[PDB]
Design a binder for these strands. Structure first.
Ligand SMILES: [Mg+2]
Length: 1051
RNA sequence: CGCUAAAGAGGAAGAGGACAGUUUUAGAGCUGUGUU
RNA sequence: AACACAGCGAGUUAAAAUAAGGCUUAGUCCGUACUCAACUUGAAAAGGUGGCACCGAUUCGGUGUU
DNA sequence: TGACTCACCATGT
DNA sequence: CCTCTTCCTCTTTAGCG
DNA sequence: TGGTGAGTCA
């Protein structure tokens, strides 16, 4: 029997359905391997495959660039330290050493607690004389007195460590008029104002009430000044709290005004220091180096280098400064030396690296995939475009009947006279020329509406900048012009643009040269120079451009030149293109590269895998059709490649399987007309129901009207034939062929939409990113947690391994990659007594590699004197308990084996009578449908049976009891409560995408819901040791049709 | 279905740089009393 | 000597880290992207393994056969 | 001393 | 939050296999 | 939405 696959490719789901005949999904008994007693499990061929959504690489890119910037910053400080090392060693041996051990607790510090000066008194004096670093920077910048070298290094390292934004280009040099340092003076002003205003607010809040004083200033937890300085509060929250407190108090207008202008007790380091140019820091740096150079000689020699450390930005075109082994770097080194900031010009070739940066990402031409595309603004590309549009210009003749294309000489004269004269060509100018050259008047133009899309913009621009028409006119100079446009396109920095442009300096003038240096064009074309001009045809010895400009017989567009049988352009392109044989091998490689975000790419790859395994399931008989709907078009191409690869002859490729792309509206139209409603909340069976329905629709549409088929198949709607609003049986019109029967086939459609069994599968993944509230997370939390409590049990990853997590605080939230079952012998009961213990051990993403290197050693470090088997369970591994409860194992906690997050794999099935009610309930607030209101008003008695069914399903397969009791207590108000609240409680708010009562019975993680005004907490207390007793691990396949039940008890 | 160009709209990949946030330490704790 | 109860004062900043880390790959580089049912040939590229029909549906069950 | 409960929280412009 | 670069995709126009 | 700290009971 024949069969046709259907598919629902999607971001988080792929739904697969197989139809043999008469719109029916066949049932096949699939063997079950493993230590089980169920030899054959009979599975319906409806199915779904659920996967975690693919993640874009933006977060990885942002964290990679951040990582690199921290590394480069520490390298800049190390550079300044190597500059200061020889002279500082006499002043203080361990100043750098004391700075490096600032994090450490006093005992673990190598020399002293006080970082800067190493003794209590001098540190006290430093903080007294300069309360903040900005006072120090101002003093060094403006005081012509010898400074302790430590202080100078601290100021310079403050500027290098925190330098300003580089957006402003040029040289940049406030209320203060005499100071060298503007920023230092402004922040010293903020220091003084904040101190004085703190004193005044202290007096006021204390005087009204001492309790307010204590709460605001001496209680860190609150949002007051104690929260502002020694807490997690921010300016906005502190202002809100202060205004709320101060509003009641009488006469507190000064503080309220300053808060209103957002300048009341401001902090020197604020989110508002972002808009500070680096030139301000450089102005301070120059002053400090200059004034202290006279006293310290080494500063005079290294003054240029110290500035270079601050102002050096790795150019964007010169990427990561690798020697290789880096996937992202493109830099092309010219020497072998290490890349210090001073020698970056020497070591690296900026021209070659900048050219590689653009040419690595440019696209090879499709027609002849061996050459790079021409620059978008090249004269050749425009001249190719201008003629191509101009050739097909057809003018209606006032007297002559014939509608005729432009003559070649007319094309030459038109382009010369007008296209070169004016940037924007129109219809009117061409009608004028045609009237001038030919006496006919009243001519209109075809192929051209109003302005020409094509223009020689580059010709006019280069004419003005060059200031010479003759240079553009001459064909000999055309190669020079092409090289000029190439250097403008590839190179973006004006310096290197003029550097390469200096080659063609003899022809032009320097003033013209610089003006050309300003002009940079962007973008690249989709054709190549060799194609347009290099390729030739033997019979005429003419390029494609030569034919477009002058093809005597008629004006033919570029594709017509390429495809014409007489011309050898088609032979040339085919020769080159099958020289370019890049099938890419495995389907993984081609699927990775199709257009889109990785999220859809995952769906596509899994859809190919489902189709392959479905072919294996059905006996190896290739599908009669496949119907991808994306309810992706790239799949159609990919599925065409694998299935329709075979060609009877090299001349053409035969097609056997019709990859089909139904439009989305068809499924919705069928669903609404015949009331096969979908509720996304109830169960995940809707993906499979959608796939089966579209398989049915596509089969019928191809069955009844073959005429539309060519459009529908790859390479007044049709839904009316599904509508009988007509004889009982529908048969093809104009021929005798099978068409869908109006009632009997509908019976099969509804029954297959009321099948309890759908082979739902959640792909077992070994996680690499932890998940918090749906946002990816790494190995652990990105923010260091506070120091543990004095007598609190914490599993904190240290900041660095040499730093103890207890004393120095640590990282919390270790994410678990997977969990391994370990049968073996464990010391238990403190007597080391042997036992046959089958218990999970969770493995973190942190130590995944360590586990993989030696599984036995990792498991043995955790006990397990003898290990006899290690079943390795990825996330979402499925256990079916004895009762019939399926508990997918999300993870086993790394810290504790006996705690883990277990989802619920059981999917509730609701009869059609309930599903209609639920769909109506979710759509109640919708203004469009009165029928929803009337149905929910007429069938309120369904709600009682629905609640009881959800609660019994909760009782048997789910394990929630307290939530069930709260739900039962809440439901007693069913007879009298708001119908809007009844519906929202059962299904959810309209459009919320959050389920109501069905969040108790949905698959996956449990989430909080509100039922009739009662907040029901999420049930997350499934225990990981309940899986082990009397349950069977199910190793389902990608389709889910093929499973291996490894019973844990016999194991 | 595949192309080229124009005006619109929306993404993807990559490079460079800034500001904050978090953690520990250094820079403010002192006095009277309860207390073992 | 330490823990606390009350009173009175300071509070703005600096250093270090900012995914743990890995390497003969030692770079001013890489470390959250894509890939991953089970058993079994596979160093690896890539492959192999699971009969059909019929009646029904609270998750698949029961039949007829080979 | 391990199942059965509840509460807090997490990097962004 | 700022600067830069390329590659894609969707509807519509002009030509087109 | 997943870690997991902390509390009370058989
Ligand atoms: Mg690092």
């Amino acid at each position: 029997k024949p069969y046709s696959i259907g598919l629902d490719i999607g971001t988080n789901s792929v739904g697969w359905a197989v139809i043999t005949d008469n719109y029916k999904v066949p049932s096949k008994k699939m063997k079950v391997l493993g230590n089980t007693s169920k030899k054959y499990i009979k599975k319906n061929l409806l199915g779904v495959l659920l996967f975690d959504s693919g993640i874009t690489a933006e977060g990885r890119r942002l964290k990679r660039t951040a990582r690199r910037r921290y590394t480069r910053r520490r390298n800049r400080i190390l550079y300044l330290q190597e500059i200061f090392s020889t002279e500082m060693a006499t002043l203080d041996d361990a100043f750098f050493q004391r700075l490096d051990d600032s994090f450490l607790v006093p005992d673990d510090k190598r020399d002293s607690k006080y970082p800067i000066f190493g003794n209590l008194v001098e540190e006290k004096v430093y903080h007294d004389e300069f309360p903040t670093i900005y006072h120090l920077r101002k003093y060094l910048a403006d005081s012509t007195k010898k400074a302790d070298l430590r202080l100078v290094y601290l100021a310079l390292a403050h500027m290098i460590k925190y330098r300003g934004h580089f957006l402003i280009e040029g040289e940049f040099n406030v209320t203060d008029n005499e100071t060298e340092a503007p920023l230092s003076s402004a922040m010293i002003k903020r220091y003084n104002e904040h101190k004085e205003d703190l004193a005044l607010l202290k007096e006021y809040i204390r005087n009204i009430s001492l309790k307010t004083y204590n709460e605001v200033f001496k209680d860190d937890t609150k949002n007051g000044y104690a929260g502002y300085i020694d807490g997690k509060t921010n300016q906005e929250d502190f202002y809100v709290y202060l205004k709320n407190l101060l509003a009641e108090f009488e006469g507190a207008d000064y503080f309220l005004e300053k808060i209103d202008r957002e300048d009341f007790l401001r902090k020197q380091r604020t989110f508002d220091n972002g808009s500070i140019p680096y030139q301000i820091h450089l102005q301070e740096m120059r002053a400090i180096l200059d004034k202290q150079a006279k006293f310290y000689p080494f500063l005079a020699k290294n003054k240029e280098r110290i500035e270079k450390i601050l102002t050096f930005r790795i150019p964007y075109y010169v990427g990561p400064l690798a020697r290789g082994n880096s996937d992202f770097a493109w830099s092309i080194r010219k020497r072998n030396e290490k890349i210090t900031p001073w020698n970056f010009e020497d070591v690296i070739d900026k021209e070659s690296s900048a050219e590689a940066f653009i040419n690595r990402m440019t696209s090879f031409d499709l027609y002849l995939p061996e050459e790079k595309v021409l620059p978008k603004h090249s004269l050749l590309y425009e001249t190719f475009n201008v003629y191509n549009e101009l050739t097909k210009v057809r003018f209606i003749a006032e007297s002559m009947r014939d509608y005729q294309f432009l003559d070649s000489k007319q094309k030459k004269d038109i382009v010369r006279l007008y296209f070169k004269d004016k940037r924007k060509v129109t219809d009117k100018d061409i009608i004028e020329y045609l009237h001038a050259i030919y006496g006919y008047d009243g001519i209109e133009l075809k192929g051209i509406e109003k302005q020409f899309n094509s223009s020689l913009s580059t010709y006019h621009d280069l004419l003005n900048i060059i200031n010479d028409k003759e240079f553009l006119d001459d064909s000999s100079n055309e190669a020079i012009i092409e090289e000029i446009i190439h250097t403008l396109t590839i190179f973006e920095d004006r310096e290197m643009i003029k550097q390469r442009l200096s080659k063609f300096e003899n022809i032009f003038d320097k003033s013209v040269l610089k003006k050309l240096s300003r002009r940079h064009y962007t973008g690249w074309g989709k054709l190549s120079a060799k194609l347009i001009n290099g390729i030739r045809d033997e019979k005429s010895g003419n390029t494609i451009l030569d034919y477009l400009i002058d093809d005597g017989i008629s004006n033919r567009n570029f594709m017509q030149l390429i495809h014409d049988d007489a011309l050898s352009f088609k032979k040339k392109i085919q020769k080159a293109q099958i020289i370019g044989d890049e099938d890419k091998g495995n389907i993984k490689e081609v699927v990775k590269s199709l257009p889109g975000s990785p999220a859809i790419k995952k769906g596509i790859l899994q859809s190919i895998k489902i189709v392959d395994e479905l072919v294996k399931v059905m006996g190896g008989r290739k599908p009669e059709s496949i119907v991808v709907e994306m309810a992706t078009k790239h799949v159609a191409r990919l599925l065409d490649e694998k299935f329709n690869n075979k060609k009877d002859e090299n001349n053409r490729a035969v097609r056997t399987v019709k990859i089909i792309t139904l439009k989305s509206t068809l499924v919705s139209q069928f669903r609404k007309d015949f009331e096969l409603y979908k509720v996304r909340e109830i169960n995940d069976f809707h993906h499979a129901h959608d796939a089966y329905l579209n398989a049915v629709i596509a089969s019928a549409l191809l069955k009844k009207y073959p005429k539309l088929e060519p459009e529908f198949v790859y390479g007044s709607n049709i839904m009316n034939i599904f509508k009988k609003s007509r004889p009982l049986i529908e048969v093809n019109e104009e021929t005798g062929e099978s068409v869908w029967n109006k009632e009997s086939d509908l019976a099969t459609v509804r029954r297959v939409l009321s099948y309890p069994q759908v082979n739902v599968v959640k792909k077992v993944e070994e996680q690499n990113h932890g998940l918090d509230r749906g946002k990816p997370k790494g190995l652990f939390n990105a923010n260091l947690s506070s120091k543990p409590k004095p007598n609190s049990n914490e599993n904190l990853v240290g900041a660095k391994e040499y730093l103890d997590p207890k004393k120095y605080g640590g990282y919390a939230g270790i994410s678990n990659s997977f969990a391994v079952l370990v049968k073996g012998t464990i010391e238990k009961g403190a007597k080391k007594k042997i036992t046959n213990v089958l218990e999970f051990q969770g493995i973190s993403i942190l130590d995944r590699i360590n586990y993989r290197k030696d599984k036995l050693n990792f498991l043995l470090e955790k006990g397990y004197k003898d290990i006899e088997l290690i079943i390795e369970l990825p996330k979402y591994s499925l256990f079916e308990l004895s009762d019939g409860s399926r508990r997918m194992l999300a993870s086993i906690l790394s810290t504790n084996n006996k705690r883990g997050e277990i989802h619920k794999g059981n999917q509730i099935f609701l009869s059609q009578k309930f599903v209609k009610l639920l769909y109506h309930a979710k759509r109640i607030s919708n203004t469009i449908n009165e029928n929803h209101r009337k149905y929910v008003e007429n069938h309120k008695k369904e709600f009682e049976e629905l609640f009881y069914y959800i609660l019994e399903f909760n009782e048997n397969y789910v394990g929630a009891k307290k939530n069930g009791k709260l739900l039962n207590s809440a439901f007693q108000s069913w007879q009298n409560h708001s119908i809007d609240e009844l519906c929202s409680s059962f299904i959810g708010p309209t459009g919320s995408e959050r389920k109501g009562l069905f969040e108790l019975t949905s698959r996956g993680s449990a989430a909080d819901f509100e039922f009739l005004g009662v907040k029901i907490p999420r049930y997350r207390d499934y225990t990981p040791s309940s899986l082990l007793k009397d349950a069977t691990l199910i190793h389902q396949s990608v389709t889910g049709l093929y499973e291996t039940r490894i019973d844990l008890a016999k194991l």
